[PDB]
Design a binder for this molecule. Structure first.
Ligand code: SF4
Ligand code: SF4
Lengths: 193, 194
């Protein structure tokens, strides 16, 4: 697959697409159009205009298909990128949505939280809460294995769990204030002394 | 000169963002990635953490005798004495735009990076050309894309955010509306390619 990424050093999403490519050892050509001369900029825009008439950044060309804008799932779909986070995202969505627990709509935040669940599943053997420190002992951590014991009262009182991974329909659609959620876990559960 | 300790988790996103700011501003600190430590070292880092934050929550930053619990980057910066040209411009943009109904994106990290882009563009061009667009460097050719651009008002009225997602409406901010992708509204003929 021949990939070209039209990018700008000042464009945050352009750098995130580039980062994903580098991390997954994807073979691509990145054009940081703003680092070019006045005439090279004109030529980069003419090349871009042929595949994206709006001359907008980011734009990804994969062989003969073009993905315009911050459409990370569509870019992944044309390149053939499938990770265990994508798999777990689908599983969690199917299981939780009928229960009224929606995954946070900020996809980039939810994806890093799911990556945290996976990192915890590998090192501990269970999906310990990604925004808490686990002990590594399953029995001590039983109340913070996701979904934790605190999700139900936290979502009922504030509209979201402690990591903001699961949110209610009201939190999702802004019908309630998106309040900060305090740590409900009894501090004694660490068994420090 | 201040003694700084950041209690962090490798699985905590904001923890790495606080650490990134420290490193980029030469702020010396101890970073404890509590989850990388052994079983008994986890209990001791939690004992040190518990003394300053009984709830044993991450992130937690200790600056001398003052403790900041949670993702409170502004509070951390005020206690250390961090005050950058981005902070200055953020305040100027906030005071000028909030009374008009144009709020700065609540994802404070993304807003700061956009403001850094505005500053990078002011330095290399002489004006704050839109950081998510390609500037020519000719003010007259870029006139419609000097921040705030000619397209902010129609984009925010129709989608709730400007093209870069720097300025958002109150409904976008609180989640009352869907946060849709904003397409490039600029007529491509303005680029004067041929
Ligand atoms: S707070 Fe949220 S992310 Fe953490 S364990 Fe509970 S449900 Fe899972
Ligand atoms: S799209 Fe937003 S960030 Fe870009 S110039 Fe317009 S108002 Fe400024």
């Amino acid at each position: 697959k021949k990939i070209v990424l039209y990018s700008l050093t000042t464009c945050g999403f352009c750098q995130a697409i580039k980062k994903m490519f580098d991390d997954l050892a994807v073979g691509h050509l990145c054009i940081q159009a703003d680092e070019l001369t006045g005439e090279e900029k004109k030529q980069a825009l003419r090349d871009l205009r042929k595949v994206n008439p709006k001359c907008s950044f980011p734009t990804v060309v994969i062989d003969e298909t073009v993905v315009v804008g911050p459409k990370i799932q569509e870019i992944k779909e044309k390149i053939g990128i499938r990770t265990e986070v994508d798999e777990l995202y689908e599983v969690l969505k199917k299981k939780n949505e009928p229960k009224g627990y929606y995954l946070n709509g900020d996809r980039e935040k939810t994806f890093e939280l799911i990556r945290g669940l996976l990192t915890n599943k590998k090192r501990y053997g269970y999906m310990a809460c990604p925004c808490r420190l686990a002990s590594g002992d399953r029995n001590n951590d039983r109340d913070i294995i996701c979904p934790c014991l605190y999700r139900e009262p936290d979502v009922k009182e504030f509209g979201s769990c402690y990591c903001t991974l699961y949110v209610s329909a009201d939190w999702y659609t802004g019908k309630i204030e998106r309040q900060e959620v305090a740590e409900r876990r009894p501090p004694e559960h660490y068994e420090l002394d």
